[PDB]
Design a protein around this ligand. Structure first.
Ligand SMILES: *[C@@H]1O[C@H](CO)[C@@H](O[C@@H]2O[C@H](CO)[C@@H](O[C@@H]3O[C@H](CO)[C@@H](O)[C@H](O)[C@@H]3O)[C@H](O)[C@H]2NC(C)=O)[C@H](O)[C@H]1NC(C)=O
Ligand SMILES: *[C@@H]1O[C@H](CO)[C@@H](O[C@@H]2O[C@H](CO)[C@@H](O)[C@H](O)[C@H]2NC(C)=O)[C@H](O)[C@H]1NC(C)=O
Ligand SMILES: *[C@@H]1O[C@H](CO)[C@@H](O[C@@H]2O[C@H](CO)[C@@H](O)[C@H](O)[C@H]2NC(C)=O)[C@H](O)[C@H]1NC(C)=O
Ligand SMILES: *[C@@H]1O[C@H](CO)[C@@H](O)[C@H](O)[C@H]1NC(C)=O
Ligand SMILES: *[C@@H]1O[C@H](CO)[C@@H](O)[C@H](O)[C@H]1NC(C)=O
Ligand SMILES: *[C@@H]1O[C@H](CO)[C@@H](O)[C@H](O)[C@H]1NC(C)=O
Ligand SMILES: *[C@@H]1O[C@H](CO)[C@@H](O)[C@H](O)[C@H]1NC(C)=O
Ligand SMILES: *[C@@H]1O[C@H](CO)[C@@H](O)[C@H](O)[C@H]1NC(C)=O
Ligand SMILES: *[C@@H]1O[C@H](CO)[C@@H](O)[C@H](O)[C@H]1NC(C)=O
Ligand SMILES: *[C@@H]1O[C@H](CO)[C@@H](O)[C@H](O)[C@H]1NC(C)=O
Ligand SMILES: *[C@@H]1O[C@H](CO)[C@@H](O)[C@H](O)[C@H]1NC(C)=O
Ligand SMILES: *[C@@H]1O[C@H](CO)[C@@H](O)[C@H](O)[C@H]1NC(C)=O
Ligand SMILES: *[C@@H]1O[C@H](CO)[C@@H](O)[C@H](O)[C@H]1NC(C)=O
Ligand SMILES: *[C@@H]1O[C@H](CO)[C@@H](O)[C@H](O)[C@H]1NC(C)=O
Ligand SMILES: *[C@@H]1O[C@H](CO)[C@@H](O)[C@H](O)[C@H]1NC(C)=O
Ligand SMILES: *[C@@H]1O[C@H](CO)[C@@H](O)[C@H](O)[C@H]1NC(C)=O
Ligand SMILES: *[C@@H]1O[C@H](CO)[C@@H](O)[C@H](O)[C@H]1NC(C)=O
Ligand SMILES: *[C@@H]1O[C@H](CO)[C@@H](O)[C@H](O)[C@H]1NC(C)=O
Ligand SMILES: *[C@@H]1O[C@H](CO)[C@@H](O)[C@H](O)[C@H]1NC(C)=O
Ligand SMILES: *[C@@H]1O[C@H](CO)[C@@H](O)[C@H](O)[C@H]1NC(C)=O
Lengths: 129, 447, 129, 129
C-alpha cells in the first residue's frame, strides 16, 4: 500500500517511518542564454546542492547507506519529555519537527562528535592488533 | 550454478553521443587578440595522451559528425564577437562620384564624397580608392555616381585593425565523462568500421582556414591520396579530395597600397585606401605546372577506382555560381583574394613554367551565408605575400544523360562545413557509461 | 600493469574488470559571458550530473562504496544463454553491453526491488530485538 | 571542546585528528546576469566540484563512510623515516603535508590499486561459495 511522495505527511511518526523509501526516490530525480535556460541551469545546481547537503550530514554521522540509523547520543529530557506512546502514536513528523526545531542545531553537533568523531579513533585502536 | 548479477563500476563501455566541446590553443605569447583564440582558450597540455585501443573496431561517419556542426557555429560566433566593438560603417553609404585611375583601354576607381566628421555640423569631402567589386552604379543610365555593394542589402562593420585573421591551430577537447576516438587507418574512407582505433582528449592542431575549391594549409593524407564522399554515385554531394604530396602556391599583391585614416566621428576611425605608390599590378598566384599536373594525375588514378578501370575524366572551370564559389577565395595578410581557377582545371584524361592564376581583391565580404552583416577589410599597408600549401580539393560532378562514356569534374564550394570535415573525419565523440551488470556465482553476505 | 584510460576496452570482461579504478578516476575530474565561458560552465554541471546519476543508482542497489557488488537477483536465462567461460573469456564489455542492452532496464528495475527494497525492512526487523 | 573551523591548524596531528567533523561541515555549504550572480553561480559549481573530487577518492579507497580509515598499504620508509612520536605528537598536518607532498601522488596510486582494486575481486571469489 503506497500513497506517494509525502503520502504519510499527516500520519503518525510510526506510520510515516515505514515508507521512507518513497520520499528518498523523488528527492534527486542558437543560444542557450534563454531566461528558461538560466532558470534550468540554476535549478539543476540548486537541486544537487540540497541533495549532497543531506548526504554530507549522513556521512559524518555514520549513516550513509541506511535509512533508519541508531546512534550513541542519549536523548536529553530538555528537548522533549513526551513518552514513546505519545510521540510515535500521537504526533506527526510536521508538528514534531516544529517542536525540536530549537534543539536540532545542538543535536547535530553532538550527533557527529559523540560517536563517529570518537568511533573512528576507537575502531582504529580496536583494530590496532 | 546459482548465478547472480553483479554491479561493475568503471567498465570500458561507451555510446555514441553529442556533447559540448570547448576550445584549446597552445601557449602562444605575442599584436594579439586574434578572433579564434579570443582572449582565453584552454592551454594545451605539454604532452597529449594518445592511448591506442587494441581489438577495438568502431564505426565512424564523417558526414553525420557533430564536431563539424559545433565547430561551424563556433567560428561564426567568434566572428561576430570580434566585430561588435569595432567601427560600424553605416554612415559610409553616401553617393560616391568616381573616376578611372591615365591609362588608355581598370579594376579600381578613385571616388570623392561628402563624409561626416568628429563634429555634427561640420562635413568633409575626402577622396579614396575602391575596388570595382565593392561598388555598384546607382543610375544604370549611367552617369558617374556609385554606391557600396552592401548599403542596399545589409549593414557593414569595419574590422578592427588590431585583430588578425591568421589561422592558428585549434584543439577541440572533450569534457569529463566523454572521450574522442581517433581512427588511425591509413586507407580509411568516409564511413565504415575502423580497425585501428585510439583515443585522445583533444584533437590535433586544426587551422581554421576559410577557403573555396582549394583546401589550403590542411592535413595531408598518408600513403595514397584519398577520395571521400557521402555518395560517390550522387552528383549533389561534394567530393572531398585529400592529397599526399603538398602542392605549392605563391600569391602576391604587387600593389603598394597606402592606409588613409580619416576620422568620421567621436572615436570612430575609418581606414580607406590611399593612392597606390608605384605601378598598378593586379594580384596573381603561381602554381608549378610540373607539380600540379603530377598531383592531378595522381588524383585521376584513384578516381578510376570508382568509375571504371578505363574511362574519360576531364576537368573544367566552375560553371555555376558567382562571386566566391567560382573563384579560389581565401584570406592572405588581411586582404581577401578571389583567384580564377580556370588554368588549373583545363585537362582531359584517357587510358620552371609555373601556372599563373589571376586574382581579384574585395573589401566588403559576405561569408557564411550571412544575410545582414557585411565586413569591411581595412587596407593592409605595404606589399602582401603569402605561401600556402594546397592539400585538398572540393569537386562536384556534372551528371546528365551520359552513358558512363565521359565524366567531368568541376570545383565548387557550396558550403563551409566541408572544410572542417577534411580535418574532423577521423574524430568521434562518445560518452562513457561505466555501469555494467554481469552474472557470477557470487551472493551478497547477509551477516 | 596499467594501459591508460579505456585501455582494456578490447580485452575480455575478466581482464577488463580488474581495471575498474582506471575509468572511475577520469569520470568526474570584464564579462565572463564569452562563448567559451558559458560552454565551460554548462559542461562542468553536465559532468557532475552524469557522475551523481550513476552514484544514485548504486545507492538504491546498496553498492555505493564498492566497485564489485554482489546481489540477490537471480540471472534469468532469457537475458543470455552463454556460459561464464563464453562470457568472461570470449566477450568484451562492449559487445556484452550490446547483447543485454534490451534487458538493462528490466535488470535495473529488479536490482532495486529484489534486495535493498526488501533487505532494509528485514534489516530493521532482524535488528529489532 | 570545539575551537571552530581550522581551529586545530596549529595543533599536533594527534590532537587535530579528534576534530575531523569540524572541517567536514564547513567544507561544502529582471536578469541574473549581474557580475555578482555570475561569480556566485560559478562559486557554487566550483565548490561542489572540489567536494565530489575528495569523495571520489574515498570511493576508490574503500573509505566512503568513515573519517578515519585503515588500509592494506605498507608505509615505505622512503616517504618519511620519522616515528609515531615525532609525527603525531610534534608535527602539524601543515608541515606534514609539506613533507609528503613529493610522494602524495605515489601513495594515492598504491592506495587505489593495492587494496580496493584487489579486495573486491577477492571478495567476489571468497563470497563465490
Ligand atoms: C598558410 O600558412 C602560411 C605559413 O607560412 C601562411 O603564410 C604566412 O602568413 C603569415 C601571416 O601572418 C605571414 O606573417 C606575416 O609576415 C609579414 C612579413 O613582413 C609581417 O609583416 C606580418 O606582421 C606577419 O608576421 C608569413 O610571412 C607568411 N609566410 C611566409 C613564408 O611569408 C599562409 O598565409 C597560410 N594560408 C592562409 C590562407 O592564410
Ligand atoms: C607545408 O609545406 C612545407 C614545406 O616545407 C612542409 O614543411 C615541412 O614538413 C616537415 C614534416 O614535419 C618538417 O620537418 C619541416 O620542418 C616542415 N617545414 C616547414 C617550413 O614547415 C609542410 O609539411 C607542409 N604542410 C602542410 C600542412 O601541407
Ligand atoms: C569559365 O570558362 C568559360 C569559357 O571560356 C568562360 O566564359 C567566357 O568568359 C569570358 C570572360 O572572361 C567571356 O568574354 C566569354 O564570352 C565567355 N564564354 C566563352 C569564351 O565561350 C568563363 O568566364 C569562365 N569562368 C566562369 C566562372 O565560368
Ligand atoms: C488519516 O486518518 C485516518 C483515520 O484516522 C487514518 O486511517 C489514515 O491513516 C490517516 N492518514 C494520514 C496520511 O494521516
Ligand atoms: C541536557 O540539556 C542541557 C540543555 O540543552 C545541556 O546543557 C546539557 O549539557 C544536556 N546534558 C546531557 C547529559 O546531555
Ligand atoms: C508518561 O505517561 C504517564 C502515564 O502512564 C504520565 O503520567 C507521564 O506524565 C508521561 N510522561 C510525560 C508526559 O513526560
Ligand atoms: C573605367 O574602366 C572600366 C574598366 O576598365 C570600364 O569598364 C569603364 O567603361 C571605364 N569608365 C568609363 C567612363 O568608360
Ligand atoms: C556635399 O558636397 C557638395 C559638393 O560636391 C556641396 O555642394 C554640398 O554642400 C556638400 N554637402 C554638405 C552637407 O556638406
Ligand atoms: C568504406 O569502407 C567500408 C568498409 O566496410 C565500405 O563498406 C564502404 O563502402 C567504403 N566507402 C567507400 C565510399 O568506399
Ligand atoms: C583622386 O581624386 C581626387 C579628387 O578628385 C584628386 O584630388 C586626387 O588627385 C586623385 N588621386 C588619385 C590617385 O586618383
Ligand atoms: C614560391 O616561393 C618559394 C620561396 O621563396 C620558392 O622557393 C618557390 O620556388 C616559389 N614558387 C613559385 C611557383 O614561385
Ligand atoms: C602531365 O603528366 C603526364 C604524365 O607525366 C603527361 O603524360 C602529360 O603530358 C602531362 N601534361 C601536362 C599538361 O604537363
Ligand atoms: C584494374 O584492373 C586490375 C586487373 O584486373 C585490377 O587489379 C585493378 O584493381 C583495377 N583498377 C581499377 C581502378 O579498376
Ligand atoms: C585550355 O587549354 C587549351 C589547350 O591547351 C587552350 O587552347 C585554352 O586556351 C586553355 N584555356 C585556358 C583558360 O587556359
Ligand atoms: C525468467 O523470466 C520469465 C518471464 O517472466 C519467468 O517465467 C521465469 O521464471 C524467469 N526465470 C528465472 C530463472 O528468473
Ligand atoms: C535488441 O535490441 C537491438 C537494438 O538494435 C535490436 O536490433 C534487436 O532486434 C533486439 N532484440 C530483441 C530480441 O528484442
Ligand atoms: C599551541 O601551543 C601551546 C603551547 O603551550 C599548546 O598548549 C597548545 O595545545 C597548542 N595548540 C592550540 C593552542 O591549539
Ligand atoms: C621503498 O621504495 C624504494 C624506492 O622505490 C624501493 O627501492 C624499496 O624497495 C621500497 N621499500 C618498501 C618496503 O616498499
Ligand atoms: C624518533 O625520532 C626522533 C627524531 O628523529 C628521535 O629523537 C627519537 O630517538 C626516535 N625514537 C623515539 C622512540 O622517539
Ligand atoms: C621536494 O622536492 C623539492 C624539489 O627538489 C625539494 O626542494 C624538497 O626538499 C622536496 N621535499 C621533500 C620532503 O622531499
Amino acid at each position: 500500500v503506497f500513497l506517494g511522495f509525502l503520502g504519510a505527511a499527516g500520519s503518525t511518526m510510526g506510520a510515516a517511518s515505514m515508507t521512507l523509501t518513497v520520499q528518498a526516490r523523488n528527492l534527486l530525480s542558437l543560444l542557450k542564454l534563454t531566461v528558461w535556460g538560466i532558470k534550468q541551469l540554476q535549478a539543476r545546481v540548486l537541486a544537487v546542492e540540497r541533495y549532497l547537503r543531506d548526504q554530507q550530514l549522513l556521512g559524518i554521522w555514520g549513516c550513509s547507506g541506511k535509512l533508519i540509523c541508531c546512534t550513541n547520543v542519549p536523548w536529553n529530557s530538555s528537548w522533549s519529555n513526551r513518552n514513546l506512546s505519545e510521540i510515535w502514536d500521537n504526533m506527526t513528523w510536521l508538528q514534531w519537527d516544529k517542536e525540536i526545531s530549537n534543539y536540532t542545531q545542538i543535536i547535530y553537533g553532538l550527533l557527529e562528535e559523540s560517536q563517529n568523531q570518537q568511533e573512528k579513533n576507537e575502531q582504529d585502536l580496536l583494530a590496532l592488533d | 550454478e546459482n548465478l547472480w548479477v553483479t554491479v561493475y563500476y568503471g567498465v570500458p563501455v561507451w555510446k555514441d553521443a553529442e556533447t559540448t566541446l570547448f576550445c584549446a590553443s597552445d601557449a602562444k605569447a605575442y599584436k594579439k587578440h586574434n578572433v579564434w583564440a579570443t582572449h582565453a582558450c584552454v592551454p594545451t597540455d605539454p604532452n597529449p595522451q594518445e592511448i591506442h585501443l587494441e581489438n577495438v573496431t568502431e564505426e565512424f561517419n564523417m558526414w553525420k559528425n557533430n564536431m563539424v556542426e559545433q565547430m561551424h557555429t563556433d567560428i561564426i560566433s567568434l566572428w561576430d564577437q570580434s566585430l561588435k566593438p569595432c567601427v560600424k560603417l553605416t554612415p559610409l553609404c553616401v553617393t560616391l562620384q568616381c573616376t578611372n585611375v591615365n591609362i588608355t583601354d581598370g579594376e579600381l576607381k578613385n571616388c570623392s564624397f561628402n563624409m561626416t566628421t568628429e563634429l555634427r555640423d561640420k562635413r568633409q569631402k575626402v577622396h579614396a580608392l575602391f575596388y570595382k567589386l565593392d561598388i555598384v552604379p546607382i543610375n544604370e543610365n549611367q552617369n558617374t555616381s556609385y554606391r557600396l555593394i552592401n548599403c542596399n542589402t545589409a549593414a557593414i562593420t569595419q574590422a578592427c585593425p588590431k585583430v588578425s585573421f591568421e589561422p592558428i591551430p585549434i584543439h577541440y577537447c572533450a569534457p569529463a565523462g566523454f572521450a574522442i576516438l581517433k581512427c588511425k587507418d591509413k586507407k580509411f574512407n568516409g564511413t565504415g568500421p575502423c580497425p585501428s582505433v585510439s583515443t585522445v582528449q583533444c584533437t590535433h592542431g586544426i587551422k581554421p582556414v576559410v577557403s573555396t575549391q582549394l583546401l589550403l594549409n590542411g592535413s595531408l593524407a598518408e600513403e595514397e591520396v584519398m577520395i571521400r564522399s557521402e555518395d560517390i554515385r550522387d552528383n549533389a554531394k561534394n567530393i572531398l579530395v585529400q592529397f599526399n604530396t603538398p602542392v605549392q602556391i605563391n600569391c602576391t599583391r604587387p600593389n603598394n597600397n597606402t592606409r588613409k585614416s580619416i576620422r568620421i566621428g567621436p572615436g570612430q576611425w575609418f581606414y580607406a585606401t590611399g593612392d597606390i605608390i608605384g605601378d598598378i599590378r593586379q594580384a596573381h598566384c603561381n602554381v608549378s605546372k610540373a607539380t600540379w599536373n603530377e598531383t592531378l594525375g595522381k588524383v585521376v588514378k584513384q578516381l578510376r577506382k570508382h568509375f571504371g578501370n578505363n574511362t574519360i575524366i576531364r576537368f573544367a572551370n566552375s560553371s555555376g555560381g558567382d562571386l566566391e564559389v567560382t573563384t579560389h577565395s581565401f584570406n592572405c595578410g588581411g586582404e581577401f583574394f578571389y583567384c580564377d581557377t580556370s588554368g588549373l582545371f583545363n585537362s582531359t584524361w584517357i587510358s620552371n613554367d609555373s601556372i599563373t592564376l589571376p586574382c581579384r581583391i574585395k573589401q566588403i565580404i559576405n561569408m557564411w551565408q550571412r544575410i545582414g552583416q557585411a565586413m569591411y577589410a581595412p587596407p593592409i599597408q605595404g606589399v602582401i605575400r603569402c605561401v600556402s600549401n594546397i592539400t585538398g580539393l572540393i569537386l562536384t560532378r556534372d551528371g546528365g544523360s551520359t552513358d558512363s562514356t565521359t565524366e567531368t569534374f568541376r570545383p565548387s564550394g557550396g558550403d563551409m562545413r566541408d572544410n572542417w570535415r577534411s580535418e574532423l573525419y577521423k574524430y568521434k565523440v562518445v560518452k562513457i557509461e561505466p555501469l555494467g551488470v554481469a552474472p557470477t556465482r557470487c551472493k551478497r553476505r547477509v551477516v
